[PDB]
């Protein structure tokens, strides 16, 4: 086929160059030319290494990887009930409850009560003995809880009502 003829016509060109580098490079003064080729390969090798380790997440997201690095870096320096509530909001299957919006659903589940306790300590309304690093690990913990339940678990619920694979 034409596509199979095109790839074969490419390796022929590469094999012609391979028989040139395997000879006496210094005598046949191709030493300078090959050095230019090696620079291009080196530059492209480092670029593809940067894109990797930038999506080193199970979800493969730019934001998700960045949050994990910051979270781990805080634990080095520093030397439950609400999570279950947010899981039920994103796992609703009634059909009519989800049609009333998310503001109504949050009020019914009393999600605002665990949230109020944490913010009061940060502002200073309620005095507490917890240090700064304990509170930072709390706010950043609930942020990742919302993303996991809504950006990853909610689409699975919607697709689960179909008896097929669209």
């Amino acid at each position: 086929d034409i596509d199979t003829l095109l790839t074969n016509a490419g390796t022929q060109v590469m094999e012609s160059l391979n028989r040139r580098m395997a000879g006496d490079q210094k005598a046949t003064n191709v030493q300078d030319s090959i050095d230019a080729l090696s620079e291009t390969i080196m530059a492209a090798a480092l670029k593809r290494e940067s894109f990797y380790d930038a999506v080193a997440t199970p979800t493969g997201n730019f934001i998700d990887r960045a949050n994990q690095y910051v979270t781990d870096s805080i634990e080095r320096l520093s030397e439950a009930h609400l999570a279950k509530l947010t899981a039920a909001i994103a796992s609703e299957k009634q059909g009519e409850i989800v049609a009333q919006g998310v503001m109504t659903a949050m009020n019914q589940g009393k999600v605002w009560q665990p949230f109020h306790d944490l913010v009061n300590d940060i502002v200073g309304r309620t005095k507490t003995n917890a240090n700064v690093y304990d509170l930072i690990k709390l706010v950043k913990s609930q942020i990742s809880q919302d993303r996991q339940q809504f950006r990853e678990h909610l689409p699975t619920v919607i697709a689960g009502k179909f008896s097929r694979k669209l």
């Binding site: 490419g10 030319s33 620079e39 291009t40 390969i41 990797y52 999506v55 689960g160």
Partner: protein, 1471 residues
């Protein structure tokens, strides 16, 4: 008892008498119980005739309530014909006896009173009867004997083993790497003399129902049945039941005068009713039959001894695993047996094998190789359908009859099914009989039970399900089910409804499956097609399974059980590829392979192979012919062997668990020459297959040229195919005409005749003889040697050291046992020489043999691990007797004498421990652990689990792996070697025995004139080395148990096991985790050691002291050294102060603690051996000019001040900077002395001096043979090590030494350093102390930029959903690396403007690459990189050769003539 029954035997029952003797009445006794039903039968042949006449008749004789339902009236007629045939042989045997009695008047000689019953061939006569002038057989013994022959006739081939390479070579006399092809296959039908007679002899003895007297000669309790067995086989071969083939071996090679013989047994027809119930005779004449099939409540017994090792018993822990495995019930898959029989046997052979066979269009050497593939499938197919016939007769529904199998420990502790063709071994029966079952709800395609269903389908269709997430697997599987596999599924659906297949069923599957063809791929198609037509998907019942295969189970187990010393960051990364994760809870292999690393151990070794190969090729830049030879060998590999990672991945071969990959083979102690022949055999086999395609293409078109017929599929034009053919011809000619030779450490080429010429003749093309030998010589020197260097780098140096000591310890102990065993039989035989009753030709009694065997118990020949027992030296040799056991009546076939005696171990010690304790223990632990999984089929390193509990039984598989990793093979071996040396004496061994053990203990130069004192001393050193290794392994296993770990070794689902540690090692670099593990390692050492015993600014967090520059003025003259050397310190220190050198010192605990706080790499020199001595050495960081000392003193401080200054001259000189003329000569002179350092003789030096030279030469050559480091850095390191050896050994080589060359070498190197330090000014006289015995002992740390090939090959196999998972693009990059990347210069890349002609093309191509991506062609990260690199290669080549693009232009104009805008529009009528 014995005398009471058949008392008419000729002879006197008295023990000692002058008359004739009947030795049968003394050799065999009468068992108190009942073993055979024919003991009291006057006519055994007729007595069983009335037993096999009707179902009712068979009931009484067997003493059973009911008989097997398969024993119906149809097979009754068949047994009458066979047993009548078994009545004609009994008359043949009687006729042969009469001829022997009259030939050469042998019977007449008995009339005088000659002892003719004691001859080699007269042992048969011991059971004859007296009738006057002539003799006759005893009817009861004769008729019972032929019953064993009939039973042996039916099931002989079903139990014969498979001949191995060594035995085939042993009986041939030529190595299997050099013998002509085809003769190996002849083992499939024929069996040697010993195999036939030994198997038949056992049945005859068992059927007689008599025991053996322990006080009788071994020539009668073992020779009488053998003489009887040889007579039946001789009767059968003349009765056309057995055909004898005599092979003349002088044709293949004239020097082989041996004339071997093969015996083949005629086979019954496939549809013969006897195949249904072939064991009627065996279960009628015996009480506890061994040949049986267990149905329902029948349970196989438990073996009491190992397989072919009666001296070793099964441990109670081992016996528990046998009970569990044999209790698992199997079932037959009805929908699969219908598919097999409808397709037909002939169609199966064409589909699975190489299609239809015709000698006209097949190569001669290729055709004979395909016979083995066809033979295995035909035999496995026939065996499977013989079992089904018996099962179908037991119940109305075939899928409700349980079947039980039998297991037994092998010689390495692995469970093994009994039988040649079983679900464990044969892959054809694996798809028909399964123990797995499941019930799933598939009514919804988004359920959780549907993901498990897709996992089984994807894995069976050759998809790496263990390297991708559960979402990528579904995406890739659905493409196949709607693409190439669509036509195959449609036919399958039709079969499930009407039960018919098209006439082109074989052709359709070949097109669809492609290279994914397997016996399990046909089951996946059946299950998927059965699911579509099902009307109720809520209760689907399927036997589909998923295999939890281990990831490189061989090297990983050996690396974790036989490694000692401190932890290393490289070891941490390498062990991650096996499934051991440190500081990462709830981690799986799928996450590791997708986000961390996609390179495995096999790929890592190959990457290091090319790194070292490029270094070797660069060393011969001045020898062009040598380089061209290297390219020719590599070019030939690319054409026919794209990959070197072999294995047991074939679909037409039985699974035996033997590892054949080069990586695991090299670990197991195989020789370099042996693996060279194996690699050549793969290349030659690939060449022959291409010849068959040329002949096949010729028939279709008789006008195609040779080039187009061979390289048609990879040619872009007719001229391109000519270049490939011409290149191949030149490559094969050079390799077979020139060979490399090793001269004084450097290779050279020599001519060895003429190679292949310019003539193909594909019908009769072969390579053998001188040409074949020349091929392996090139392979060994150019590919095998770099392979060994690459393998050692990845698996760790310390692992290689632990294996070498294990092999030497087991080899030495085996030779002593063998020699001592042979020295006691000769003494016993000589003792019996004065007994008139004893006659030469017999042997020792069973009781006597046991006493000799029991006399070696003090030498500890067995290794105990607490639950397993190993006997390495045990074997059934034959040279210890050097006699003839028995023979045929006409003296046609002579059977030698074989005894169970210890033999030489060789190199079998390494694989015995790794397999026995590494993988063998895991399966044993898995069966007997609490809550063990049920209904599973574990073969050797995998397991088949039902789809219902994939995530639960896989978790317990990883738990067993963790438990099996707590063992210590070295400690068990050392506990036996230590006892062996306590009760040994080397002064009583045979002279040849001392030579055998001298080849392992001593070196090459010290082998000659080896005194018995040197042998004893050398053997004692190995025991000491084993003690330290067992201590290091024990401590390491203790430290790893105190940290959190995740184990995902044997899994593919993603259910790891957690070791519930307590020390958190997360959020740390792999370099950082090593320091924490080392801290716990050192605390364990001092805890045990204490049990046996029962100036500058100071840092704040640690007690170390910092002595910066401009603060050492006072200490200059504090040492009160002489003014001749005192002035040197002022100058040397002045230069150091200008470079801002800092000094840090303290106790080992303080100096190590400070490094962890400031993230400083430490290189302290201390180990377990050094801990006892109590010596600690610091290190120097050359990057930031920092000197570290541990527990310093005034003397060692001065040594390091001049050590740092001296190394600067060495480093600067090798970096290209100018050096003073006085210093230039000194380094140049030292370089010259280095070239003579590695070419010295040491055999005449002190034993301690040998170790100093051996250690120095090991590291010196390692630096020079490194291809991934800067040449300037590597050269400086090698010279620094040379200086250290000379100064360290000066103190003890300056006394009690002779005028040896090595001793002289120390003086020359010491003088060279003196001039370098002092320069042109006056130096102290010769023989004077330099700086109070100055030594160099601190290591130096250096770093440099990596090479281009290091970073390009790292990201070749990157794949992820967000990064790009195009499989085809990964393969294209791999071929790009071979052609272009591997041939770049090893020097690190630089940055210059680089004006010229080629750079303009490269710069322009980069801009055009970007414009394509931004103008409608959006590409991922993976696709962008490949497109960028490939285009660069085509850009520079087109810039040099203007005609390189001539062909590509022609294809471009044709494409442009058929292109339209609507081609790129997904919906052509969009709005």
């Amino acid at each position: 008892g014995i005398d009471a029954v058949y008392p008419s035997l000729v002879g006197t029952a008295d023990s000692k008498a002058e008359g004739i003797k009947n030795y049968f009445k003394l050799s065999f006794t009468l068992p108190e119980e009942q073993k055979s039903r024919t003991v009291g039968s006057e006519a055994p042949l007729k007595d069983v005739a009335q037993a096999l006449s009707s179902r009712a008749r068979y009931e009484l004789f067997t003493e059973k309530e009911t008989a097997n339902p398969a024993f119906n009236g149809e097979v009754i007629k068949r047994y009458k014909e066979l047993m009548e045939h078994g009545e004609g042989i009994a008359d043949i045997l009687r006729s042969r006896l009469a001829k022997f009695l009259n030939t050469k008047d042998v019977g007449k000689r008995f009339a005088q009173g000659t002892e003719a019953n004691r001859w080699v061939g007269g042992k048969l006569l011991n059971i004859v009867e007296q009738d006057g002038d002539t003799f006759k057989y005893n009817e009861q013994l004769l008729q019972t004997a032929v019953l064993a022959g009939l039973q042996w006739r039916l099931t002989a081939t079903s139990n014969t083993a498979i001949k191995d390479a060594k035995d085939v070579a042993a009986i041939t006399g030529i190595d299997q790497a050099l013998l002509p092809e085809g003769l190996v296959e002849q083992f499939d039908t024929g069996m040697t003399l010993t195999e036939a007679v030994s198997s038949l002899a056992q049945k005859i003895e068992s059927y007689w129902g008599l025991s053996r007297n322990p006080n009788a000669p071994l020539g009668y309790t073992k020779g009488i049945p053998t003489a009887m067995a040889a007579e039946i086989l001789a009767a059968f071969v003349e009765s056309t039941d057995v055909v004898e083939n005599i092979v003349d071996m002088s044709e293949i090679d004239p020097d082989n005068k041996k004339t071997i013989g093969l015996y083949t047994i005629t086979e019954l027809d496939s549809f013969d009713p006897i195949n249904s119930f072939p064991t009627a005779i065996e279960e009628a004449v015996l009480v506890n039959p061994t040949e049986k099939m267990f149905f329902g409540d029948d349970i196989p017994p438990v073996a009491n001894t190992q397989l072919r090792n009666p001296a070793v018993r099964n441990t109670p822990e081992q016996k528990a695993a046998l009970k569990a495995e044999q209790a698992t019930e199997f079932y037959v898959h009805t929908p699969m047996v219908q598919f097999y029989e409808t397709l037909g046997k002939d169609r199966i052979l064409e589909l699975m094998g190489a299609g239809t066979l015709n000698k006209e269009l097949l190569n001669d050497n290729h055709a004979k190789s395909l016979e083995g593939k066809n033979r295995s499938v035909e035999d496995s197919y026939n065996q499977l359908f013989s079992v089904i016939e018996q099962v179908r007769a037991q119940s109305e529904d075939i899928s409700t009859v349980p079947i039980h199998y039998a297991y037994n420990m092998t010689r390495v502790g692995r469970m093994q099914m009994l039988g040649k063709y079983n679900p464990q071994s044969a892959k054809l029966v694996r798809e028909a009989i399964l123990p797995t079952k499941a019930t799933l709800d598939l009514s919804n395609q988004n359920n959780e039970d549907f993901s498990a269903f897709q996992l089984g389908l994807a894995q069976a269709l050759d998809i790496k399900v263990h390297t991708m997430t559960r979402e990528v697997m579904s995406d890739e599987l659905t493409k196949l089910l709607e693409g190439n596999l669509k036509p195959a599924i449609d036919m399958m659906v039709e079969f499930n409804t009407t039960g018919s297949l098209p006439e082109n069923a074989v052709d359709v599957l070949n097109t669809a499956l492609g290279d994914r063809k397997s016996f399990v791929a046909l089951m996946a198609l059946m299950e998927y097609s059965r699911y579509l037509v099902a009307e109720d998907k809520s209760a689907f019942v399927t036997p589909l399974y998923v295999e939890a295969d281990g990831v490189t189970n061989g090297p990983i187990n050996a690396m974790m059980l036989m490694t000692g010393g401190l932890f290393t960051p490289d070891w941490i990364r390498n062990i991650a590829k096996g499934g051991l994760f440190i500081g990462s809870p709830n981690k799986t292999m799928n996450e590791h392979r997708s986000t961390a690393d996609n390179n495995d151990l096999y790929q890592a070794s190959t990457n290091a192979l090319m790194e070292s190969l490029g270094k070797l090729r660069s060393n011969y830049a001045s020898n062009m012919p040598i380089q061209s030879q290297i390219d020719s060998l590599l070019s030939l590999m690319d054409l026919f062997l794209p990959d070197i990672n072999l294995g047991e991945n074939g679909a037409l071969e039985l699974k035996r668990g033997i590892a054949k990959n080069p990586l695991t083979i090299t670990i197991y102690g195989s020789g370099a020459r042996g693996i060279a022949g194996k690699l050549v055999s793969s290349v030659t086999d690939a060449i022959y297959e291409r010849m068959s395609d040329v002949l096949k293409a010729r028939a279709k078109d008789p006008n195609i040229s040779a080039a187009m017929a061979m390289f048609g599929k990879q040619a872009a034009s007719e001229a391109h195919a000519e270049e490939l053919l011409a290149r191949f011809l030149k490559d094969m000619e050079t390799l077979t005409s020139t060979v490399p030779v090793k001269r004084k450490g450097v290779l050279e080429l020599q001519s060895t005749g003429t190679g292949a010429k310019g003539k193909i003749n594909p019908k009769t093309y072969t390579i053998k003889g001188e040409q074949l030998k020349a091929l392996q010589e090139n392979m060994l020197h150019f590919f095998v040697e770099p392979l060994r260097n690459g393998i050692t780098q990845t698996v760790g140096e310390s692992l290689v050291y632990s294996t070498e000591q294990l092999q030497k310890a087991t080899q030495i102990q085996s030779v002593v046992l063998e020699d001592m065993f042979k020295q006691r039989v000769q003494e016993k035989l000589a003792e019996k020489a004065k007994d008139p009753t004893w006659k030469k030709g017999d042997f020792l009694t069973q009781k006597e043999l046991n006493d000799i065997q029991a006399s070696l118990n003090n030498l500890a020949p067995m290794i105990e691990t607490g639950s397993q027992t190993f006997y390495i030296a045990g074997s059934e040799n034959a040279e210890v007797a050097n006699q003839v056991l028995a023979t045929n009546l006409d003296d046609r076939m002579r059977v030698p004498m074989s005894i169970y005696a210890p033999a030489q171990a060789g190199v079998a010690g390494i694989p015995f421990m790794t397999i026995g304790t590494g993988d063998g223990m895991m399966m044993q632990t898995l069966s007997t652990m609490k809550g063990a999984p049920k209904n599973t089929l574990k073969i050797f390193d995998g397991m088949n689990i039902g789809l219902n509990d994939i995530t639960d039984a896989s978790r317990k598989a990883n738990e067993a792996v963790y438990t099996s990793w707590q063992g210590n093979p070295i400690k068990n071996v050392y506990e036996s070697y230590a006892k062996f040396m306590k009760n040994v004496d080397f002064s009583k061994l045979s002279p040849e025995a001392l030579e055998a053990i001298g080849k392992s203990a001593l070196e090459y130069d010290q082998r000659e004139n080896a005194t018995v004192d040197d042998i004893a001393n050398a053997a004692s050193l190995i025991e000491r080395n084993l003690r330290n290794i067992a201590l290091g392994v024990d401590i390491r296993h203790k430290v790893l148990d105190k940290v959190n770990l995740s184990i995902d070794q044997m899994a593919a689902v993603g259910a790891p096991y957690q070791n519930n540690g307590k020390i958190d090692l997360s959020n740390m670099t792999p370099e950082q985790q090593a320091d924490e593990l080392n801290k716990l390692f050192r605390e364990e050492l001092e805890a045990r050691k204490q049990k046996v015993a029962k100036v500058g600014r100071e840092h704040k967090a640690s007690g170390v002291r910092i002595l910066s520059a401009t603060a050492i003025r006072n200490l200059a003259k504090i040492s009160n050294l002489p003014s001749t050397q005192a002035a040197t310190l002022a100058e040397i220190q002045k230069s150091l102060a200008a470079k801002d050198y800092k000094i840090i010192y303290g106790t080992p605990t303080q100096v190590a603690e400070y490094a962890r706080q400031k993230n400083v790499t430490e290189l302290t020199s201390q180990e377990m051996e050094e801990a006892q001595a109590g010596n600690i050495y610091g290190w120097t960081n050359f990057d930031d000019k920092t000197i570290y000392l541990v527990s310093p003193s005034m003397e060692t401080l001065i040594h390091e001040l001049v050590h740092a200054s001296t190394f600067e001259e060495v480093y600067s000189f090798y970096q290209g900077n100018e050096v003073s003329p006085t210093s230039k000569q000194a380094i140049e002179n030292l370089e010259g002395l280095m070239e003579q350092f590695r070419s010295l003789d040491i055999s005449k030096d002190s034993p301690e001096m040998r170790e100093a030279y051996a250690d120095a030469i090991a590291t010196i050559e390692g630096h020079l043979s490194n291809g991934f480091v800067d040449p300037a850095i590597s050269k400086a390191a090698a010279l620094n090590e040379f200086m250290a050896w000379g100064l360290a050994n000066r103190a003890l080589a300056a006394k009690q030494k002779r005028t040896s060359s090595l001793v002289q070498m120390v003086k020359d190197v010491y003088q060279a350093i003196k001039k370098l330090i002092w320069g042109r000014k006056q130096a102290p006289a010769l023989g004077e102390d330099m700086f109070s015995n100055l030594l160099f002992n601190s290591a130096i740390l250096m770093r440099s930029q990596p090479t281009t090939q290091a970073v390009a090959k790292d990201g070749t196999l990157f794949h992820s959903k967000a990064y790009g998972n195009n499989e085809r693009l990964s393969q294209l990059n791999q071929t790009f690396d071979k052609l272009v990347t591997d041939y770049l210069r090893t020097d690190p890349v630089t940055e210059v403007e680089r004006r010229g002609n080629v750079a303009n093309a490269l710069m322009s191509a980069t801009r055009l690459v970007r414009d394509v991506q931004s103008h409608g062609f959006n590409m991922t990260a993976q696709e962008q990189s490949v497109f960028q690199m490939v285009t660069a290669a085509l850009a520079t080549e087109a810039a040099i050769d203007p005609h390189a693009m001539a062909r590509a232009q022609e294809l471009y104009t044709h494409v442009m003539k058929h292109l339209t805008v609507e081609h790129f529009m997904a919906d052509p009528d969009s709005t």
